[PDB]
Amino acid sequence: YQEPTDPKFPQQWYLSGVTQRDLNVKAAWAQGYTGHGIVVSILDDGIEKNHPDLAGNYDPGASFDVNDQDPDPQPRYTQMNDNRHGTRCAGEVAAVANNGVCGVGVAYNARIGGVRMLDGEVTDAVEARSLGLNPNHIHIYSASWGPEDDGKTVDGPARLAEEAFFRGVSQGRGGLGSIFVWASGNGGREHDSCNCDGYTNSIYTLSISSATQFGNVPWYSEACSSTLATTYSSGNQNEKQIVTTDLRQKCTESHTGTSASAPLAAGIIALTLEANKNLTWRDMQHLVVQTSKPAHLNANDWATNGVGRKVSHSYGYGLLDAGAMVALAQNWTTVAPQRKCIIDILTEPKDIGKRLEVRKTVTACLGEPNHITRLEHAQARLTLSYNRRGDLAIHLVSPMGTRSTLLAARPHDYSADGFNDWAFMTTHSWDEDPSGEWVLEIENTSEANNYGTLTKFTLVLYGTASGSLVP
Ligand SMILES: COC(=O)CC1CCN(Cc2cc(CN3CCC(CC(=O)OC)CC3)cc(-c3cc(Cl)cc(Cl)c3)c2)CC1
Ligand SMILES: *[C@@H]1O[C@H](CO)[C@@H](O)[C@H](O)[C@H]1NC(C)=O
Ligand SMILES: [Ca+2]
Ligand SMILES: [Ca+2]
Ligand SMILES: [Ca+2]
Ligand SMILES: [Cl-]
Ligand code: NA
Numbered sequence: 001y002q003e004p005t006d007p008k009f010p011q012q013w014y015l016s017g018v019t020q021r022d023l024n025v026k027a028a029w030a031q032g033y034t035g036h037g038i039v040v041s042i043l044d045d046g047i048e049k050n051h052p053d054l055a056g057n058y059d060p061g062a063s064f065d066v067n068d069q070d071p072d073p074q075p076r077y078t079q080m081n082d083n084r085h086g087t088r089c090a091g092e093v094a095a096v097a098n099n100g101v102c103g104v105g106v107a108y109n110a111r112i113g114g115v116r117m118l119d120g121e122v123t124d125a126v127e128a129r130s131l132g133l134n135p136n137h138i139h140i141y142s143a144s145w146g147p148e149d150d151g152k153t154v155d156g157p158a159r160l161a162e163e164a165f166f167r168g169v170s171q172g173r174g175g176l177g178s179i180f181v182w183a184s185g186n187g188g189r190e191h192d193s194c195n196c197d198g199y200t201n202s203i204y205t206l207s208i209s210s211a212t213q214f215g216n217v218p219w220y221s222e223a224c225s226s227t228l229a230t231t232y233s234s235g236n237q238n239e240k241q242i243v244t245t246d247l248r249q250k251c252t253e254s255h256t257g258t259s260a261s262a263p264l265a266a267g268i269i270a271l272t273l274e275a276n277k278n279l280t281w282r283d284m285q286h287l288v289v290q291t292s293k294p295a296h297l298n299a300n301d302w303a304t305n306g307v308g309r310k311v312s313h314s315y316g317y318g319l320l321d322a323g324a325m326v327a328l329a330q331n332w333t334t335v336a337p338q339r340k341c342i343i344d345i346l347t348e349p350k351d352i353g354k355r356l357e358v359r360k361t362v363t364a365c366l367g368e369p370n371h372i373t374r375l376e377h378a379q380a381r382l383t384l385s386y387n388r389r390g391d392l393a394i395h396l397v398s399p400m401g402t403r404s405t406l407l408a409a410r411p412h413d414y415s416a417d418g419f420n421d422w423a424f425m426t427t428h429s430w431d432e433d434p435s436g437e438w439v440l441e442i443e444n445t446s447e448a449n450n451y452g453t454l455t456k457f458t459l460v461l462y463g464t465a466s467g468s469l470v471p
């Protein structure tokens with residue numbers, strides 16, 4: 001195997017490193033996987049399709065302009081280069097290799113397109129028409145953005161967009177399911193908590209956070225239990241950043257944020273899908289859980305879950321490992337059909353006050369076709385009133401003792417509107433048996449005499465009842 005000759009490939013430290021602080025992408029390339037035959041679409045502000053490092057892989061069938069309602073996602077050029085982000089992300093996935101220009105994509109033989117959707121008013125319909133673009137041609141969608149990362153917003157896909165997610169994972173990709181890769185957010189400095197973003201909090205999105213070059217949680221990171229895994233991105237000014245294609249046929253070394261991590265994950269997922277085109281959307285999440293690596297990622301919340309995997313709310317299961325992903329994909333056995341066990345828990349509304357604990361022992365739909373002994377995602381769908389929402393912290397403890405933070409205190413969130421059946425999601429109990437006692441904790445983290453009521457707590461379990469590995 002001959003590594004890329006591109007002039008900035010040596011600067012793509014998160015691919016080209018020899019110090020073990022990388023995504024182990026060369027190992028996948030050397031196994032023969034480069035993204036050939038895979039189609040990825042960047043949902044963003046457009047894609048410079050004539051970029052000298054993108055044109056060779058550009059796919060009009062992976063592209064659309066839902067802002068101006070036309071097929072051509074060319075960015076709108078402005079003096080401040082506002083609409084450059086999709087071009088940066090496209091190059092992360094699929095910049096052409098060995099062509100003397102900039103660097104390379106993770107999946108440098110994949111086909112790449114973009115949906116121009118962010119350069120205009122983003123409505124439910126705009127979102128739905130983007131997520132649902134050409135779903136039997138595009139394999140993987142990469143989305144780096146969502147509701148405002150101001151640390152006070154609770155929002156997610158409205159009806160058309162949620163319908164697009166279910167159509168995508170159900171009928172997309174020939175019934176194997178569209179793979180939606182999401183950035184978990186850039187709201188770290190606002191103390192944002194990313195389960196309050198319904199896109200990344202969705203089970204249908206494969207959510208990705210960031211690590212700095214030196215292995216730390218970047219200033220912009222949001223912690224939450226819905227995150228699955230991590231890719232490298234930017235950090236402080238002594239740490240390198242992401243090197244990629246840039247608007248106006250240029251090359252940048254200063255692409256940043258969690259919004260730069262999702263495209264790298266989408267590229268690794270493209271290599272993995274080349275290794276096994278039959279992988280379902282759930283198979284892909286299983287591969288990520290099993291192969292991601294905590295080592296050398298620094299966080300104070302690494303915890304071992306009930307099946308012996310380390311998990312963090314900053315990193316999920318750790319750094320993506322492309323070599324391991326493609327290796328495990330090759331002989332992967334398709335997971336059983338997804339079961340869903342609904343457990344409505346409260347017999348009466350519960351005053352929250354300073355602190356509320358709700359304990360419930362469940363059988364996880366024992367005796368039913370939705371009996372789950374092998375958890376995938378779990379949700380606590382909560383309906384509650386509270387006078388100041390951001391003073392709440394919420395935790396969910398599984399029978400195996402895994403404490404998932406569902407909501408951390410958000411100091412800027414002054415809302416008196418509470419949560420209306422908000423489906424806080426955790427990935428941290430993946431592969432655990434969910435039978436037994438679950439504990440919900442709701443706490444007022446402020447000294448204020450805050451008040452409210454929990455009126456609904458629905459525990460929703462997803463998963464299967466066969467095929468477990470030894471912990
Ligand atoms: C009843 O109907 C409704 O309520 C319809 C609503 C429509 C808006 N929805 C949230 C939303 C917003 C934006 C726009 N904007 C926000 C600021 C951000 C930057 C930042 O946070 O700076 C601190 C940049 C994005 C975008 C995306 C988005 C993005 C991608 Cl890439 C894909 C998809 Cl599907 C959606 C989603 C909620 C539903
Ligand atoms: C894909 O997986 C399904 C489910 O296991 C199986 O029925 C089908 O034969 C597989 N197709 C290929 C091409 O491997
Ligand atoms: Ca256009
Ligand atoms: Ca190149
Ligand atoms: Ca956020
Ligand atoms: Cl469902
Ligand atoms: Na975001």
Ligand code: NA
Nearest residue numbers: 200202205207
């Ligand atoms: Na997700």
Ligand code: NA
Nearest residue numbers: 304305306401
């Ligand atoms: Na544990």
Ligand code: NA
Nearest residue numbers: 399434435436
């Ligand atoms: Na149990």
